[PDB]
Structure formats: structure tokens, C-alpha cells
Design a protein around this nucleic acid. Structure first.
Ligand SMILES: [Zn+2]
Lengths: 36, 103, 83, 244, 93, 49, 24, 69, 47, 45, 344, 306
RNA sequence: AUGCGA
């Protein structure tokens, strides 16, 4: 009963869950690393 | 002149039929009357629960819910409140006049 | 395209998206004078009325679940476990 | 309602319209401002009125605030009370906070409108006083018990939770124990509540009520708490000054 | 491809940067919309929005009239466009 | 740049020039960081839609 | 550094309601 | 603009105490504190009303276009 | 580079199968995602 | 009598549709339209 | 309603900003209490605004030019006034028989701002007033200047006075860059009252200070209060004080000589109930300024309006009855919700 | 046991000071809800009569017309507010204003120059005529009945010295103010009191006695006259707790802050009511108690609706 | 476009 419903826009959900928190943001770090 | 048809309203959704709980809605009132009314109402030994709530300052409303014991009706208990407020105000005015005279 | 009923393989449950569309479309139909099969019981919002109809599954609608192939499973309201 | 930072779907939700008289400004509850990332500093919001029953049904079922109790990023719930309401819970929730029968009931109707669908009882239920002796006395935690007993359905056992506070026990004394949050059948038996509890960071109390009774219950809890703390902030207020 | 800030052609049309497709297709202006400074309020529900009566009189719903909503919509007309739960216009069938 | 003064008792002027440095560099990072996240959003939001 | 001087007319500016500087 | 009629915070009529107060700082060569004490502005709501006033109307009035100059 | 993709499409004689949600918005079509991921029919009395 | 004040001469005057827009006492070419005894209602707030 | 801050730098006088006061000294309670005082929302006394608190006015100037089409006197034909009689004589309700409004006139959007006559149309035509709110005609200015003759007075500049009442959503700020809108105009009875018998003009929530570290505002409160009680201005020049001469002690002791809490709090009672509040409330006198950005005025609603012909899509701008944009991010975000019937 | 008459047994009043403009009175053995009711009512609910519709005929002054209208509204009038009933709204403005419901005040001032001031500055009052527009310039315009009725209560601004406006030659003000009945709740201009506030009697619990220079040294820690010392060899006593301001300054010092408690007397209320001049503050209080009673009578009178 | 709420 916790399963994801058929048809969920999970792609977009992914995109916002990676973008939105990337606003709070030896090797490349942060936004340049994520862009790279 | 007409018996005011809109001052107090009985919210059937908030009123027992068995016997002692109602929510009344008064227009154009606030804590002004409310807190005194709840104070005297709580003076009634037969009130189990009574209190007032303002739905919203902008809303210009006063809701006062009275649930009593099986020994009184909220309309009756409320009337007891109002007789208490009027008589109490008689006491206040009378002592105030008396102390003005005392000078 | 017809998935045999005995051969239907999809989720017995109504999705939140399924539930939403069902209630919306059926309500809109009621708003266009679809015959109400339940007591209006005072209600005036066709959406809450359709909500009542979902509570009784009186809705005579079927969901056509598509698969990216294009085959689909037509399911009644009266069977997909609402909740 | 949609804010400016469309950064995520949680920034554009469906709200139930309530026309407020004698207003000129869009009125919004505090619990939502951390989902819009909004602040009354001067922030502007767009209001959309959909023209179609399918989109209405979506605004009643999909975009609604309760369907956004948690973020999909992490599932830390998001919506909770803030600033003043949090500190109000800290003050009310002190074991030192006592309340008279009159006061207690006052807070209750202040926070519960049965006419608003705020209950599953159509009457009121109440606790026995903390102190039978010198002066019938109720605690504030007893108040939270009363509200929870009044917003949850009587047909169900009370929520049971073992949580923690954001307050080390050391501050309440050398033997004091006040970080242990104890919930017994829906009844707060030890500890206070704070951002950790009714904020918007998963678990705590609000997260647990959301899990047990669902988003409509959890939202109802939020409105009840918001009223409780607003009125209690009327009785006790809150201030800060140089002495602090 | 010609030979100074010349008038744009169709290619410097809906494409390039914002354009049509981006600025008027993938995103558009819309009717039934408002913009306003937001104000807090603990007395409303946490899931509702307190709309000032300028919007209450300036936002309409295309209500199909029935036997069940005849009372409410007849009343809204009675109020007229300049009153509460009113209605500004009526489109016949 | 180590400021021993505190807001309750104030900051020496030489110290105000540094807390002003940190405050500015904060406002610059704050004003550019939001412009560096739009292209990250739209560039892959186009794909997963 | 010299300290900012305190005011010379450093005197009571508040009374109870009912009272005055006839007691000051 | 002009000495406010009443103290926003309190409600005490204050518009009567301007010219005498200015006179009292002129005529009585008093100090602002004692002048307000004799004027009865015994609340800082009423104290601040007059103390902070800037009767800028005198500067406005010199621009009167209804008289030759 | 919309026009470049256009060129590659026409030169292909391409056909849009109108599945992309973006494309579907461009053509004024019910989005295929979520609530548009499926169809609704009605059971109607035949007599 | 309509009135128009010279922005530069203060001289009151009563322009007509048949005269040059100029202060006959100064010669200015800018005129403030004078206020008159005309009723306007006001809510005292 | 302009005032001179009680608390100021001595350069306030040396630079004369007292010539052009931009704010006023207000009674502030630093208190979360009402529940509308969070984050960025602050409450004003309603009766205080009724006493004129922060009352402000906005002037809009108009140029009515008719020499834009000029080109060889010849056909120039418009004269403010009438000719056809057929005009609604109710236009006299605002405009004198010369076509210009009576200085002082109340005008609402749609009312005629002037009346004129063009022989080509043989009609008395008017330029309508287009605004969201009514105004009053403040000045009517006749411009024949730089002209060669132009004696017909075809250019007039009209200045409108639009009153700006303090209102919910209007932005206000202290001298500390801690800006907030007024969430509501609290009834004076409902305010909290001190045992001094006063209720504040403005209430600012304390939880705003801990992030902002606006402690200059705390000292401004305690100094403006001291300076009102003893009745003198206080110097706020940076570093006039020193770690061994704190201002809280200087004004604190001055206040205690005055007869008030050394920490500056005062025991206040709840307007609503009447009990004494838990603690003594931090009250003081703070210079508050009304920002011109009454973004309150920025409200806009459009349920119908013009559309661009190249799209037939809502036009732009509040004053244009334009329609807000649902951009790409809002489109994508609505797809996130699954609200595809809302997205269409 | 509790009855309202047992309250009458317990309720006390003590009036410290009664000026025709100030009242300082105490209510002992009452509930806070009642004092707050009176306070709140005295502020918002006591009806008063104030200018409401100002009709300008001319204003060339450098003062904004609207603003001046607000200022004219703010002037409190020495009017017994009982001379008029409320004016409805169901009816046209021509019916709104009658001699039964409205009081008219005219203002007609024309500014001039004065015949030639010596010197330099020469005082705008010397250089100009009627440069200062005062409330004393509100000519009262009765109609018929109340013309007679005010024979012994004519309409006067409660403070003629209030500066209303300052003019310059050629500026002129002609306006007709319509003063109506209103409540301090609908606008602060209708509030008949400037400040009605109450304070609970401070209670000074001396935990252990103090003596000598610690007794007088403690005595100076409080408002001058609150703490009395008779001998000081044995105690530092409280001359009058009513004199205190609750500055809580004593708590800064452990010499005392550990041998005293600072509280209040929940039953005892120290009211301070200052009048705006329309009525004496006690008279306003009388209206407050009769108003609250009248409201309870209205609620008895009301039919329980459903 | 710039500035702006931010
Ligand atoms: Zn004052």
C-alpha cells in the first residue's frame, strides 16, 4: 500500500529533487561538479 | 424592534438534541462581551463546559459553545448568565453611584 | 488491444490519479444532468455529489489503463479497490 | 496558489478558497511558507482559478496541501508551525505551566470549533485535573492530550510515540529529564514540543499523526495547534530584551 | 545571413532564446489569474487562502445551472455582479 | 581579521571593515548562486519530463 | 577615550497613576 | 506637516500645546523636559508627539503662489 | 537550435508521434502523464 | 468669471478663448487654474 | 506626518536631514503576541492610523499635449470646451465650460480629465482618466511656452493628488533594514496595554532579531525611550561608545533615573483577557519609515482582458489588465503534480 | 457560597481622585474579565459625536484638503453626545442630516496681510491676518430646536487653542462640517477618552526585614514614598504600594532581591480614566456600566434563533 | 530594454 501509483511524473520529481536542493550549494565540488 | 432574529444563532451542527450543548453565534461582538459571559457562565455550577471563540477578527463574529450537565439547557443556562450580568451591572452601578455620593 | 478480463493483470487499486479523474469527470457529467443514482441529500457541488457516487460506486465508468504497447485493461469502478 | 520560485512542484499547490471580508491582500497560513519559501517581507503570489471540473477535482485531490505533507526529495514532511508558534509550544509545554478549569476549557474552545468539523464527537471531552487537592489544576501537556483526544476519532486508540526534543535535559535541572518525548495512547506524558516535534522535519508528533491517521488528520492537527498557540500567545505573549 | 540591428526574420522568431515557443507556447499569460502581496493569518485553515473581496467579486466560475443549483445561482444573480457569492454574467445554452 | 568585539558591546571600526567584508561577500554569493541553479534545473528537467 | 557624559537633569520622568512629583 | 491633533499612541489632544511650548522655550527659556512637564505631556506617547515635531508648514508656506512677491 | 532540429526533421520527412509532453502541449493535447496517462469510458444502458 | 493665475506674476486674470495665453501683468506663458467656491464632499478620514 | 528621529547621528544635523524628515518616532512593542506578527509581518494600531499615523500622499503628473500632430497650424481644431451640445451635460459635474476640471475635483477612473472640440468631428470629445483608484485634481497648469503663438492653449499639465493610507501589505521599515508589511490594523482595544496606560503603535516579533542580529534596534529602542522621557536627542554615531561604556548602561541608568525598567521592559496586560503578560515587554520609541513600495498597490486580477493579435493570449501588465505568465517552470511543476487536466 | 449578591458583599470601590477631566478609581474584589470589559467598552463602545462629513467650498491653502478634513474630524467637541441619535444609512444623505441627528459647524476664514509690520520678521500674526486657524474658528450653526437646546449647551470646540491650519494672504477656507454620533470602536475619533487604562495593585512581599542603611538603601530602590521606614532599626516598611511603578529595579541587587517578592493583587484594580473633555470620566464610566447592562438586556431580549 | 519586489 506504499507503492508508487502508475503514471507518476517521477522523471520531473527526480529533476526537482536534484535541482531545488542544489540551490543550497582538492576536487571539483558543488554546482560545477554537478554540471560537469 | 423585532425580536432580534440574527443576534444569536443556534448551530444545529453544534447543538445536542439530548440536552445541553449548543454553539451560538453572535454578530458584532468580541471578547468584550465574550470573556465576561464565559466568566459568569463558568460561575454556573451546572455548566460542565462553556467557552467562546472568535472565528476571526476580520469576521466580526463571536461563537460561544455551552455544554451543561443533564440538569439544564444551554439556552436556560445562558439566560441565567444574562440575568447574572444585568444584576451584576446593577451592583456595579449602584456601588459606583454610592461612592460618588460618598465624596 | 483487448486484454481479456480473465487475463487482466493490473493493480486492483484505484490510483490517486485514477480516483481524481473519475470523480472529476463523473461530477462534470452530473453537472450536465447525468442521472443521479443517489440522494442529493442537500448537496449542490457536483464534485461532492460525485464524491458520494464514488462512495457508493454507483458510477458507471470504466478506466482504460494503457500499456505503452497500446493494449489496455478496462476496469469498472465497482471493482478496482477504491482504498 | 503558486509562488515565485517554481523550483519545485511543492511551490504550486491547491488551496480551498476563503473570501475574507475587508481584505486587500492575499492571506496565507504560516505553515505553508516554508514550502513556497515565502516570507511576508514583500513576497507576491499568483492565484489561479481553474475553470474545469477535471481541474477542480485535481485541485481537491492532487494539488491539495495535504497531498504535499512530505517532500518527494526526502520525505521529511515540510509543513509545520514556525517562530512564535514554536516558542509558544516551548512555554506552554513546560511542566511548570498550570491552567484553571476555566482557563483550560477556554483554550479548548479557543482551539476547537465542532461547528467547523473540528471533531469526531459533536460534543466535548475533557480530562480530570492534574491536582484534585488544593486547586483543581490542568497542565499544558494535559491540554495537548485533550486536543489530541478531541481531534482524533474516538473509535481509535491514541497515538503511541517515543520521540526526543531539541532540548538537552541539563537545562531543566540536575535530575530533570525533559528531552525524552513520551506519547502514550495519544497522551503526552513527558517532554515538550518544538521544531523537532511540530515543525516540518518528519517524525516528532505531527509526522506520526500524519502516518497513523493520514494527511487530513495531520492538517487538522496543524490548524488546531496554530489556534492553540496563537491564543496561548495571547495569554502569555512572548518578548525578548536586553536582559536576555 | 545578410549584409546593424536589422529587423528580425522568422528564424530569429520563436526559437533562439525566450521567443514564442518558450515565451508564448511552453509558457503563456493566462486569464482567471491574480497577483498579490501575501499576508499571514492563523485563523484561516492551513489549507485555505483568504482572498480579499476585490477578488471575490472579480473571479467567476462557469456554472452549469441545474435543478440542484438553481437556488444558489438564482441567488447569485440576485446579488448581481456587485455583491458577495454573486455572478457577473450569464451565458445561455 | 579576528574580531574580539561583540554586538552587545559593539565592534571596533577596524572590525566593522571586516564584518562588512564578510557581509558583502555573502551578498554576492547569495545573488549569484540562484542564477547558477536555473540552468541546472531546466537543462535536465527538459529530459525527464 | 573619554566616556560620553551622563545628563545633569537626570531625574524621575514617571509616576504612578494617582501621584506626582510632590513626592520627589 | 502640522503639529498632529492627537498623540497617535495615547489619544491625548496635543495640538493646543505647540505654540505655548515653542513660546515656553522662547519666552520661558525653559528646557524641553520641564516645558513638557508644565504642559502635562506626562506620557512618552504625548512626550514624543511634540518633542519630535517638525512644523515644516513654515517652509511650505513661503511658496504661496496667491500673493505677489 | 529549434530550427536545426527542424531541419533534421524535415530532411528526414520526420513524423511526430506526438508522445512528448512538451510537444503535446504545443499541439493542444491532453498530456499523456498522470491523469492523462489513461482513458475514461462510461457504462451506459443498452435498453 | 473663470480665473487663471500667472505662474510668474501672481496676477489674477480671466482668460478667454479669444486671447493669448500670457500674463498681461508679467507676460508669463504658464498659468495655474484658480480654485473657486465649489462644493466637494469629504469623509472626515 | 513627519518627525525628527529622537536617536540620530550628529551628522543628521550637520547634513541637515532634518530638513526633509522621512519617518517618525513610533511606540514599538517587541512582542510576538497576536499571531499575525511572524517573520515579516508587523501590526500597527488601528486607532493610531485613524489618528493619522504614517499618512502619506502620492502625486501623479500628467501632460496633455495636442501639438504632437501639429504640422502647419492649418487643420488644428481642438479647443478645450464644447460645440455640439450633444455631449453629456453631466461632464460639467467635473469640467468647467473651458474643458478643464475644477481644481479640487474628485475624479475616478473613467471620468473625463478634460474636454475639447475638434472641428473635424464636430464633437465635444474628452480624454478619459485611467487609473485603479479615484484622485483629486491638484493643479491645472497652462503651457503656451516655447511656442511661437499657440494661443489656444493646447498643452496643459494636470497634477493629481492620490492619497495613500497606511494599509495591510504596505511595507514599513525601521532604521535597521528590517522591513516588514503591516499584516493587520489591530483595534486599539485589542492591543496590549502597559501599566503606563498606553498601547504601542507598532509591534515587531522578537524572533526576527536572532537571525538578523539587529541589536542596533534594541539600543535604538532603549535610547529613544530614554530620550523621550528625559526629553533630549541621543547620539548614535558609531563608536561614540566603547566596550567599557556600553549604551545599555548609559541609557539604562538614565532610564532608571527616569523611573523605568533598567532593562527597558514594562509589565503589560493582554487587551483581550486582561491578565498580566508573562514578562515585562520591551517597549521603546523607534524611527519607522514607510517605504514607497506599497506593493499592496501592486495587486492585480484579470478574469478577462485584451489579447495580442499575434497570439490571442493575455496581454501584459497590471495597468494594462495584462495576465501573469505561467512560465516553463510552472508548466513543468504542474506536470510534476500530475495535474494534467489542470495543465491543459 | 457564591451568588451575585456574595459578589456585592465582596466588591468594593475606592475613588482616589475625581477631577472633572480625570478619574483615578479602584475596583477591589472583582474579576479581570469585568475590568477589561469596562476598559474595552469605555474605549471603543462609548458613543461620541464627531465631525463626519466635511463640505469644502474653497481651500486654496498649502494644506492638503483631505488631510485638513481628517484634522477637522479629530477635533473633539464639547457636546453632550446624547443630544443626537444615530444616523442611518438606509436613506439618502439629504435625509441623513437633520437637526435630530447632525450638528453643523461652519468655517469661513480669509487670510489677509496685516497693515504693515515694522522691523523684519514682524510675526506672521503681525505681518499677516488670521495666519493661525484655530478650533475657536468653528462657528456653531444650530437649527431651530437645538438652536434653543444649546442656549445653555452651545457647541464649542473642546480646545479652541488647537491650531487647525496656517494660511497666507489670499488663501481661504470655507467648509461646513457635519458632526455625527459614532463609537470609539468605529474610529478613534469617536473615542471620548484619550487614555483609559488599569493597573493591578502591586504587592510587595517583604521576605525578611531589612534595617539601618540597608533599609533606607532598599527604600531608595523604590519609588519615593512606596517604602516607608519608621525607625529602620527593625524594618523597612511600605508606606504605600500604590505609589509603585513595578520598575523591578530592586532585582538588580541581591541585598534585597533574595528577601522580597514583587507581585500584584489580582482582585484590586487601579483604574485611570482621562477624559477628552466631552464628558467627565466618571460619567463615561457610568455609560460603560449602563452600556454593558444594556447589552445584557439586549441578549435577554433577543429571541433564541435557530 | 532599465530599474525594481527579491
Ligand atoms: Zn501621547
Amino acid at each position: 500500500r506504499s507503492l508508487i501509483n502508475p503514471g507518476e511524473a517521477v522523471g520531473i520529481i527526480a529533476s526537482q529533487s536534484v535541482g531545488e536542493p542544489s540551490t543550497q550549494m582538492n576536487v571539483t565540488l558543488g554546482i560545477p561538479r554537478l554540471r560537469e | 424592534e423585532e425580536p432580534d432574529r440574527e443576534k444569536i444563532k443556534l448551530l444545529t451542527q453544534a447543538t445536542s438534541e439530548d440536552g445541553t450543548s449548543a454553539s451560538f453565534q453572535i454578530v458584532e461582538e468580541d471578547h468584550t462581551l465574550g470573556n465576561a459571559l464565559r466568566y459568569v457562565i463558568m460561575k454556573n455550577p451546572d455548566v460542565e463546559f462553556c467557552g467562546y471563540s472568535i472565528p476571526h477578527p476580520s469576521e466580526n463574529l463571536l461563537n460561544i459553545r455551552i455544554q451543561t450537565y443533564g440538569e439544564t439547557t444551554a439556552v436556560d443556562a445562558l439566560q441565567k448568565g444574562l440575568k447574572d450580568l444585568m444584576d451584576l451591572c446593577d451592583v456595579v452601578e449602584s456601588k459606583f453611584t454610592e461612592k460618588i455620593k460618598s465624596m | 488491444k483487448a486484454i481479456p478480463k480473465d487475463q487482466r493483470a493490473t493493480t486492483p487499486y484505484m490510483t490517486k490519479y485514477e480516483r481524481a479523474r473519475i470523480l472529476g469527470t463523473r461530477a462534470l457529467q452530473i453537472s450536465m444532468n447525468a442521472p443521479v443514482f443517489v440522494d442529493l441529500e442537500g448537496e449542490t457541488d457536483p464534485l461532492r455529489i460525485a464524491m458520494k457516487e464514488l462512495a457508493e460506486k454507483k458510477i458507471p465508468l470504466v478506466i482504460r489503463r494503457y500499456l505503452p504497447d497500446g493494449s489496455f485493461e478496462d476496469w469498472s469502478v465497482e471493482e478496482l479497490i477504491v482504498d | 496558489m503558486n509562488r515565485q520560485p517554481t523550483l519545485h512542484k511543492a511551490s504550486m499547490m491547491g488551496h480551498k478558497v476563503r473570501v475574507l471580508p475587508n481584505e486587500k491582500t492575499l492571506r496565507l497560513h504560516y505553515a505553508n511558507t516554508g514550502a513556497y519559501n515565502a516570507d511576508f517581507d514583500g513576497d507576491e503570489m499568483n492565484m489561479h482559478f481553474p475553470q474545469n471540473e477535471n481541474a477542480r477535482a485535481e485541485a481537491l485531490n492532487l494539488a491539495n496541501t495535504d497531498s504535499q505533507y512530505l517532500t518527494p526529495t526526502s520525505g521529511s514532511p515540510v509543513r509545520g508551525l514556525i517562530q512564535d508558534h514554536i516558542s509558544a509550544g516551548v512555554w506552554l509545554t513546560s511542566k511548570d505551566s498550570f491552567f484553571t478549569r476555566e482557563q483550560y476549557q477556554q483554550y479548548i474552545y479557543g482551539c476547537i470549533r465542532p461547528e467547523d468539523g473540528h471533531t469526531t464527537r459533536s460534543k466535548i471531552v475533557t480530562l480530570p485535573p492534574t491536582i484534585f487537592k488544593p486547586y483543581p489544576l490542568w497542565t499544558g501537556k494535559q491540554i495537548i492530550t485533550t486536543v489530541l483526544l478531541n481531534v482524533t476519532p474516538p473509535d481509535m486508540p491514541g497515538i503511541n510515540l517515543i520521540s526526543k526534543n531539541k532540548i538537552k535535559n541539563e537545562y531543566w535541572g540536575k535530575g530533570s529529564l525533559e528531552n525524552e518525548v513520551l506519547f502514550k495512547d495519544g497522551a503526552l506524558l513527558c517532554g515538550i514540543l518544538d521544531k523537532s516535534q511540530y515543525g516540518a522535519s518528519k517524525y516528532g508528533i505531527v509526522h506520526s499523526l500524519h502516518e497513523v491517521y493520514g494527511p487530513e488528520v495531520a492538517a487538522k492537527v496543524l490548524s488546531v495547534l496554530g489556534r492553540l498557540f496563537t491564543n496561548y500567545i495571547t495569554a502569555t505573549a512572548f518578548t525578548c530584551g536586553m536582559d536576555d | 545571413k545578410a549584409q546593424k540591428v536589422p529587423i528580425p526574420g522568422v528564424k530569429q522568431a520563436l526559437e533562439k532564446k525566450e521567443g514564442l515557443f518558450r515565451k508564448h507556447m511552453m509558457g503563456k499569460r493566462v486569464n482567471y489569474a491574480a497577483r498579490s502581496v501575501i499576508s499571514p493569518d492563523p485563523n484561516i485553515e492551513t489549507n485555505e487562502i483568504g482572498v480579499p473581496p476585490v477578488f471575490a467579486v472579480k473571479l467567476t466560475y462557469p456554472e452549469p445551472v441545474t435543478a440542484y443549483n438553481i437556488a444558489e445561482l438564482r441567488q447569485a444573480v440576485i446579488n448581481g455582479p456587485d455583491k458577495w457569492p454573486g455572478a457577473t454574467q450569464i451565458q445561455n445554452e | 581579521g579576528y574580531v574580539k568585539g561583540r554586538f552587545y558591546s559593539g565592534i571596533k571600526p577596524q572590525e566593522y571593515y571586516f564584518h562588512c567584508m564578510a557581509g558583502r561577500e555573502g551578498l554576492i554569493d547569495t545573488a549569484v548562486k540562484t542564477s547558477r541553479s536555473g540552468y541546472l534545473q531546466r537543462c535536465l528537467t527538459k529530459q525527464l519530463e | 577615550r573619554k566616556d560620553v557624559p551622563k545628563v545633569e537633569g537626570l531625574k524621575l520622568e514617571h509616576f504612578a497613576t494617582g501621584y506626582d512629583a510632590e513626592d520627589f | 506637516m502640522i503639529v498632529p491633533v492627537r498623540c497617535f499612541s495615547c489619544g491625548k489632544v496635543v495640538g493646543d500645546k505647540w505654540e505655548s511650548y515653542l513660546n515656553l522655550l522662547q519666552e520661558d527659556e525653559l528646557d524641553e523636559g520641564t516645558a513638557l512637564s508644565r504642559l502635562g505631556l506626562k506620557r512618552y506617547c504625548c512626550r514624543r508627539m511634540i518633542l519630535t515635531h517638525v512644523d515644516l508648514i513654515e517652509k511650505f508656506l513661503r511658496y504661496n503662489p496667491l500673493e505677489k512677491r | 537550435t529549434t530550427c536545426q532540429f527542424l531541419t533534421k526533421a524535415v530532411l528526414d520527412n520526420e513524423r511526430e508521434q506526438l508522445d512528448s509532453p512538451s510537444a503535446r502541449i504545443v499541439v493542444g493535447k491532453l498530456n499523456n502523464v498522470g491523469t492523462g496517462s489513461f482513458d475514461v469510458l462510461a457504462k451506459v444502458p443498452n435498453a | 468669471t473663470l480665473k487663471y493665475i500667472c505662474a510668474e506674476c501672481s496676477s489674477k486674470l480671466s482668460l478667454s478663448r479669444t486671447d493669448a495665453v500670457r500674463c498681461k501683468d508679467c507676460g508669463h506663458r504658464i498659468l495655474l487654474k484658480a480654485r473657486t467656491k465649489r462644493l466637494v464632499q469629504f469623509e472626515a478620514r | 506626518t513627519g518627525q525628527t528621529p529622537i536617536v540620530k547621528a550628529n551628522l543628521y544635523d550637520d547634513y541637515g536631514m532634518d530638513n526633509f524628515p522621512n519617518g517618525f518616532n513610533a511606540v514599538v512593542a517587541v512582542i510576538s503576541y497576536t499571531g499575525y506578527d511572524m517573520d515579516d509581518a508587523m501590526i500597527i494600531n488601528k486607532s493610531a492610523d485613524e489618528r493619522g499615523f504614517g499618512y502619506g500622499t502620492m502625486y501623479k503628473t500628467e501632460k496633455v499635449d495636442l501639438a504632437l500632430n501639429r504640422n502647419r497650424g492649418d487643420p488644428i481644431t481642438q479647443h478645450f470646451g464644447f460645440g455640439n451640445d450633444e455631449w453629456p451635460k453631466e461632464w460639467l459635474e467635473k469640467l468647467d465650460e473651458d474643458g478643464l476640471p475644477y481644481i479640487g475635483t474628485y475624479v475616478e477612473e473613467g471620468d473625463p480629465i478634460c474636454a475639447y472640440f475638434d472641428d473635424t468631428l464636430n464633437k465635444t470629445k474628452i480624454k478619459t482618466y485611467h487609473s485603479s483608484e479615484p484622485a483629486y485634481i491638484e493643479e491645472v497648469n497652462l503651457i503656451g511656452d516655447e511656442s511661437n503663438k499657440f494661443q489656444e492653449l493646447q498643452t496643459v499639465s494636470i497634477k493629481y493628488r492620490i492619497r495613500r493610507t497606511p494599509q495591510i501589505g504596505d511595507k514599513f521599515s525601521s532604521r535597521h533594514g528590517q522591513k516588514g508589511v503591516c499584516s493587520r490594523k489591530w483595534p486599539t482595544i485589542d492591543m496590549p496595554f502597559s501599566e503606563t496606560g498606553i498601547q504601542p503603535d507598532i509591534i515587531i516579533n522578537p524572533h526576527a532579531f536572532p537571525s538578523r542580529m539587529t541589536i542596533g534596534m534594541f539600543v535604538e529602542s532603549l535610547a529613544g525611550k530614554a530620550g523621550a522621557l528625559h526629553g533630549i536627542a541621543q547620539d548614535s554615531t558609531p563608536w561614540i561608545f566603547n566596550e567599557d561604556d556600553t549604551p545599555a548602561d548609559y541609557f539604562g541608568e538614565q532610564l532608571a533615573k527616569a523611573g523605568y525598567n533598567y532593562h527597558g521592559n514594562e509589565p503589560m496586560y493582554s487587551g483581550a483577557t486582561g491578565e498580566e503578560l508573562r514578562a515585562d515587554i520591551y517597549v521603546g520609541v523607534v524611527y519607522y519609515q514607510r517605504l514607497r513600495h506599497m506593493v499592496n498597490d501592486k495587486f492585480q486580477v484579470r478574469s478577462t482582458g485584451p489579447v495580442n493579435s499575434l497570439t490571442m493570449q493575455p496581454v501584459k501588465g497590471r495597468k494594462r489588465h495584462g495576465g501573469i505568465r505561467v512560465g516553463e517552470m510552472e508548466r513543468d511543476a504542474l506536470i510534476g503534480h500530475g495535474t494534467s487536466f489542470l495543465l491543459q | 457560597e457564591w451568588n451575585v449578591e456574595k459578589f456585592k458583599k465582596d466588591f468594593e470601590v475606592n475613588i482616589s481622585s475625581l477631577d472633572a477631566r480625570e478619574a483615578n478609581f479602584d475596583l477591589i474584589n472583582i474579576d479581570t474579565s469585568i475590568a477589561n470589559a469596562f476598559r474595552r467598552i469605555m474605549i471603543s463602545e462609548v458613543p461620541s459625536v464627531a465631525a463626519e462629513y466635511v463640505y469644502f467650498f474653497n481651500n486654496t491653502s498649502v494644506i492638503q484638503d483631505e488631510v485638513l478634513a481628517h484634522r477637522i474630524g479629530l477635533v473633539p467637541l464639547k457636546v453632550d453626545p446624547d443630544m443626537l441619535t444615530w444616523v442611518d444609512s438606509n436613506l439618502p444623505d439629504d435625509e441623513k442630516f437633520t437637526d435630530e441627528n447632525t450638528i453643523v459647524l461652519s468655517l469661513n476664514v480669509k487670510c489677509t496681510r496685516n497693515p504693515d509690520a515694522p522691523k523684519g520678521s514682524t510675526d506672521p500674526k503681525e505681518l499677516y491676518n488670521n495666519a493661525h486657524v484655530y478650533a475657536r474658528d468653528l462657528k456653531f450653526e444650530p437649527q431651530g430646536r437645538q438652536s434653543t437646546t444649546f442656549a445653555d449647551c452651545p457647541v464649542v470646540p473642546a480646545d479652541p487653542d488647537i491650531l487647525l491650519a496656517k494660511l497666507r494672504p489670499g488663501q481661504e477656507i470655507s467648509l461646513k462640517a457635519h458632526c455625527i454620533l459614532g463609537i470609539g470602536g468605529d474610529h478613534a475619533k469617536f473615542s471620548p477618552v484619550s487614555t483609559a487604562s488599569y493597573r493591578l495593585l502591586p504587592q510587595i512581599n517583604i521576605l525578611q526585614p531589612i534595617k539601618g542603611e540597608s533599609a533606607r538603601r532598599f527604600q531608595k530602590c523604590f519609588p519615593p514614598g512606596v517604602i516607608g521606614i519608621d525607625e529602620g532599626s527593625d524594618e523597612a516598611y511600605v508606606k504605600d504600594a500604590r505609589k509603585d511603578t513595578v520598575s523591578r529595579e530592586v532585582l538588580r541587587y541581591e541585598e534585597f532581591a533574595d528577601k522580597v517578592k514583587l507581585g500584584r493583587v489580582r482582585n484590586h484594580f487601579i483604574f485611570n480614566v482621562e477624559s477628552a473633555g466631552a464628558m467627565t470620566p466618571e460619567e463615561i464610566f457610568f455609560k460603560s456600566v449602563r452600556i454593558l447592562k444594556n447589552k445584557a438586556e439586549y441578549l435577554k431580549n433577543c429571541p433564541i434563533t435557530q
